[PDB]
Amino acid sequence: MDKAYLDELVELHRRLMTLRERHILQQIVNLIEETGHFHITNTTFDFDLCSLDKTTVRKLQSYLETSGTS
Amino acid sequence: TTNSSSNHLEDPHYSELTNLKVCIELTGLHPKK
């Protein structure tokens, strides 16, 4: 219950559409593979953010906390 | 792995729309091997 939080993921979640670096994306997708919480369909990785805890939000943010071709 | 889980069953709430969800098209990243 923290609109601030959700309002925080609102950026990445959206900007995620502008990101196409097959390097960073493919590297993040490998993370959600560990937590074990997603759904594979067709050719798109569909997963919910509000479904995961915070400890994961600060982690997935890793790629967004430092870009510049890694 | 084969068993872990971390979330299941929740009080009657939430909704289909507005729930911050992502969709990464694997059509872009397809490096040969």
From Swiss-Prot, chain A:
Q: Which domain of life is it from?
A: Eukaryota
Please describe the organ and tissue distribution of this protein's expression: Enriched in undifferentiated hematopoietic stem cells in fetal liver, cord blood and bone marrow.
List where in the cell it is found.
Nucleus; Chromosome
Job description of the protein:
Chromatin reader component of the super elongation complex (SEC), a complex required to increase the catalytic rate of RNA polymerase II transcription by suppressing transient pausing by the polymerase at multiple sites along the DNA. Specifically recognizes and binds acylated histone H3, with a preference for histone H3 that is crotonylated. Crotonylation marks active promoters and enhancers and confers resistance to transcriptional repressors. Recognizes and binds histone H3 crotonylated at 'Lys-9' (H3K9cr), and with slightly lower affinity histone H3 crotonylated at 'Lys-18' (H3K18cr).
Q: Which disease is it linked to?
A: A chromosomal aberration involving MLLT3 is associated with acute leukemias. Translocation t(9;11)(p22;q23) with KMT2A/MLL1. The result is a rogue activator protein. Fusion protein KMT2A-MLLT3 interacts with MEN1 and PSIP1.
Q: How is this protein organized at the quaternary level?
A: Component of the super elongation complex (SEC), at least composed of EAF1, EAF2, CDK9, MLLT3/AF9, AFF (AFF1 or AFF4), the P-TEFb complex and ELL (ELL, ELL2 or ELL3). Interacts with BCOR. Interacts with CBX8. Interacts with ALKBH4.
Domain text from the record? Answer: The YEATS domain specifically recognizes and binds acylated histones, with a marked preference for histones that are crotonylated. Also binds histone H3 acetylated at 'Lys-9' (H3K9ac), but with lower affinity. Binds crotonylated lysine through a non-canonical pi-pi-pi stacking mechanism. The YEATS domain also binds DNA.
Q: What protein name is recorded for this chain? A: Protein AF-9
Q: Which organism is it from?
A: Homo sapiens
The gene for this chain is MLLT3
Q: Entire protein: which part is shown? A: 500 to 568 of 568
UniProtKB/Swiss-Prot annotation, chain B:
Q: In which tissues is it expressed?
A: Ubiquitously expressed.
Q: Where in the cell is it found?
A: Nucleus
Note the subunit structure. Interacts with BCL6; the interaction is direct. Forms ternary complexes with BCL6 and SMRT/NCOR2 on selected target genes promoters; potently repress expression. Can interact with HDAC1, HDAC3 and HDAC5. Interacts with PCGF1; the interaction is direct. Interacts with KDM2B. Component of an approximately 800 kDa repressive BCOR complex at least composed of BCOR, RYBP, PCGF1, RING1, RNF2/RING2, KDM2B and SKP1. Interacts with CPNE4 (via VWFA domain). Isoform 1 may interact with MLLT3/AF9.
Concerning its family, UniProt says:
Belongs to the BCOR family.
Could you say which disease the record links this protein to?
Microphthalmia, syndromic, 2: A very rare multiple congenital anomaly syndrome characterized by eye anomalies (congenital cataract, microphthalmia, or secondary glaucoma), facial abnormalities (long narrow face, high nasal bridge, pointed nose with cartilages separated at the tip, cleft palate, or submucous cleft palate), cardiac anomalies (atrial septal defect, ventricular septal defect, or floppy mitral valve) and dental abnormalities (canine radiculomegaly, delayed dentition, oligodontia, persistent primary teeth, or variable root length).
Q: What does this protein do?
A: Transcriptional corepressor. May specifically inhibit gene expression when recruited to promoter regions by sequence-specific DNA-binding proteins such as BCL6 and MLLT3. This repression may be mediated at least in part by histone deacetylase activities which can associate with this corepressor. Involved in the repression of TFAP2A; impairs binding of BCL6 and KDM2B to TFAP2A promoter regions.
Protein name, entry field: BCL-6 corepressor
Tell me what organism the protein belongs to.
Homo sapiens (Human)
- Please name the taxonomic classification of the source: Eukaryota, Metazoa, Chordata, Craniata, Vertebrata
Say which residues of the entire protein are included here. Answer: 1176 to 1207 of 1755
